[PDB]
């Protein structure tokens, strides 16, 4: 835009949290579906749901890892990675059932003299193989 708007510069705000970026490559919406609450026509448990809204739908930052020449890769599971995150984790362990969508923002800056490329994949049902 002629008023400066760019595909590379974004601001995301959820709850009391904001992320800014000046070097994005647009953003992805998995399978073109934005997150939604469970609709009455698809509902199943009949009790009144708990919807924590801003108390849980906010940006939580995980422990920072380190990328080196010997790094082979990292993985996380959702909701597992967030199980101890503020009131989301609390709401999760107090109830039998829960559903949730996510905004995942992976951060890694360097310099115009560094090089490297991370593939960041979100996999539905990411079953991993065992050691035996």
């Amino acid at each position: 835009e002629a008023c400066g708007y760019s595909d590379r510069v974004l601001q995301l705000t959820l709850g009391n949290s904001t992320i800014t970026t000046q070097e994005a490559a647009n953003s992805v919406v998995a399978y073109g579906r934005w997150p939604e609450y469970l609709r009455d026509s698809e509902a199943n448990p009949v009790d009144q749901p708990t919807e924590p809204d801003v108390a849980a739908c906010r940006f939580y930052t995980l422990d920072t890892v380190s990328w080196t020449k010997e790094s082979r890769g990292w993985w996380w599971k959702l909701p597992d990675a967030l199980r101890d995150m503020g009131l989301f984790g609390q709401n999760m362990y107090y109830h039998y059932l829960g559903r949730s969508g996510y905004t995942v923002h992976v951060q890694c800056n360097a310099s115009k003299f560094h090089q490297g490329a991370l593939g960041v994949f979100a996999v539905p049902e990411m079953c991993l193989a065992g050691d035996s």
């Binding site: 009455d40 199943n44 009949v46």
Partner: protein
């Protein structure tokens, strides 16, 4: 028997119920063949004691 439903004793949400009782109608409950007997016959020469 007290005709209660969940909204009588807890807070509920609106759910659009799709489930039906089709397979437990009297007809559907019985709509199967069941073994009631096994009859034995043979094809042997009839002889004075058998």
């Amino acid at each position: 028997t007290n005709p209660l439903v969940p909204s009588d004793t807890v807070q509920t949400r609106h759910v659009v119920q799709h489930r039906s009782r089709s397979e437990s109608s009297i007809e559907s409950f019985f709509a199967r063949g069941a073994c009631v007997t096994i009859m034995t016959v043979d094809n042997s020469a009839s002889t004075t004691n058998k």
